[PDB]
C-alpha cells in the first residue's frame, strides 16, 4: 500500500481530488507531470506513476533535461540540442578559448550542466 508520492521535481495531476484517498493498493496508478528543466523517462512532460509491490514506479519519475547553450567564442554544432540527466558532451571552443579549470566535457546533472558550458 503506497502513501502519497513525493515526486521530486514533479507532482500529481488532480492533486486535491486524489490526496484524501491515500494510501492506495498495489496496481493503482496516477497521471503525473514534471516541472521546468525536467522530464519523464519516456521523454515527455507527463506519464503515469504506478503503485508496485516494490513501491512507486518509476523510482525516479522526473529527470533533468539540459539544453546545450549558444557559445560565444565556441563552435555551435550542438546549439539547441537536448541532453537527458547523466549524459555528457564535448565542448569545442574557438582557438584561444577553453572551458575553465582545463575541462573537456560538460555533464547534465540534477541541477543542470556541470560545469557551465562556457568558452571564457
Amino acid at each position: 500500500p503506497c502513501d502519497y508520492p513525493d515526486i521530486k521535481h514533479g507532482g500529481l495531476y488532480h492533486e486535491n481530488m486524489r490526496r484524501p484517498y491515500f494510501p492506495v493498493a498495489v496496481g493503482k496508478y496516477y497521471s503525473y507531470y514534471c516541472d521546468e528543466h525536467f522530464e519523464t523517462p519516456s521523454g515527455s512532460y507527463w506519464d503515469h506513476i504506478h503503485c508496485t509491490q516494490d513501491g512507486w514506479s518509476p523510482a525516479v519519475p522526473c529527470l533533468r533535461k539540459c539544453y546545450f547553450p549558444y557559445l560565444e567564442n565556441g563552435y555551435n554544432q550542438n546549439h539547441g540540442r537536448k541532453f537527458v540527466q547523466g549524459k555528457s558532451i564535448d565542448v569545442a571552443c574557438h582557438p584561444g578559448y577553453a572551458l575553465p579549470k582545463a575541462q573537456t566535457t560538460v555533464t547534465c546533472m540534477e541541477n543542470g550542466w556541470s560545469p557551465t558550458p562556457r568558452c571564457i
Binding site: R18, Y29, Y30, S31, D35, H37, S44, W46, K82
Partner: protein
C-alpha cells in the same frame, strides 16, 4: 470558438463563463490555443488570464488547436502540439489534451509524432461539502477519450450515505462498459465535495475514477477515469448534470 479566444467576459453569456488553464501549461511555459483564425496565449504564472467558456456551446466538446511552448537560451521552442478538448457545463468544465506531436530531442526546432491523451484539469464553482443536499441525485452526461467523443456517463450519489456509483457506456475503444464502483464522497483540502473509486469491467478492477461536485446545490459532476488494458492506459474525461 474564435470569440472564446478574443472577446471579454459578460453576464449575458450562458455559464460556465470563465475557465483558468494552469494545469494544462507544463514546465512553467506557455499554452497557445487557436481556432477560426483567432489566437490566445496562456502563461503558467498568472491566474487572471482565462478562456471565455461563456462563448462556447453547453453539453458539447469544443476543439481548439494547441501548442505548448518553453523559453530556452533566448529561443522559444515547442514542447508539444495537438488538440485541446473542452467539455462545457453550467458550473463545470473538463479539459483533455490529445497530444499529436512532441519536441524532437535531437533537433529542438522541429517535432516528432507521439500520440497521448491526458485529462489535465477541471474548472468551475466547486460544491462545498457543507452544501450537499439530502437524499439522492442522478447525473447524466459525456464520457470522452482518445478518438472516442460519444461515450455516456450515468451516475448516482446518495448524499446521506456519502456514496456514489455509476457507469460509462458507448466508448468504442473499450470492449465493455466501464463500471464506476461504489465510492466514498469526502471533503478535500479546500472543503470541496469529491468522490474517488475503482473503475471495473464487471467485477474486475482496471483503474481509478474521481469526480468533483459543482454548483451551490451539487447540480454537476466533472472528473476523469482510467482503464488499464494490458499495459495501455486509457484516460477518460467524464462530466454530467442533474436533468
Amino acid at each position: 470558438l474564435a470569440d472564446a479566444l478574443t472577446a471579454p467576459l459578460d453576464h449575458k453569456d450562458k455559464g460556465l463563463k470563465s475557465l483558468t488553464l494552469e494545469d494544462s501549461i507544463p514546465q512553467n511555459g506557455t499554452l497557445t490555443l487557436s481556432a477560426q483564425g483567432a489566437e490566445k496565449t496562456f502563461k503558467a504564472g498568472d491566474k487572471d488570464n482565462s478562456l471565455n467558456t461563456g462563448k462556447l456551446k453547453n453539453d458539447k466538446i469544443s476543439r481548439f488547436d494547441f501548442v505548448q511552448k518553453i523559453e530556452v537560451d533566448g529561443q522559444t521552442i515547442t514542447l508539444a502540439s495537438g488538440e485541446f478538448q473542452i467539455y462545457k457545463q453550467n458550473h463545470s468544465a473538463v479539459v483533455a489534451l490529445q497530444i499529436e506531436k512532441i519536441n524532437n530531442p535531437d533537433k529542438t526546432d522541429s517535432l516528432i509524432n507521439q500520440r497521448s491523451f491526458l485529462v489535465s484539469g477541471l474548472g468551475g464553482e466547486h460544491t462545498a461539502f457543507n452544501q450537499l443536499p439530502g437524499g439522492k441525485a442522478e447525473y447524466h452526461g459525456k464520457a470522452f477519450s482518445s478518438d472516442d467523443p460519444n461515450g455516456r456517463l450515468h451516475y448516482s450519489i446518495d448524499f446521506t450515505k456519502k456514496q456514489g456509483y455509476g457507469r460509462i457506456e458507448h466508448l468504442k475503444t473499450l470492449e465493455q462498459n466501464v463500471e464506476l464502483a461504489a465510492a466514498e464522497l469526502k471533503a478535500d483540502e479546500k472543503s470541496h465535495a469529491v468522490i474517488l473509486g475503482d473503475t471495473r469491467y464487471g467485477s474486475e478492477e482496471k483503474g481509478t475514477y474521481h469526480l468533483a461536485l459543482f454548483g451551490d446545490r451539487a447540480q454537476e459532476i466533472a472528473g476523469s477515469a482510467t482503464v488499464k488494458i494490458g499495459e495501455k492506459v486509457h484516460e477518460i474525461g467524464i462530466a454530467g448534470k442533474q436533468l
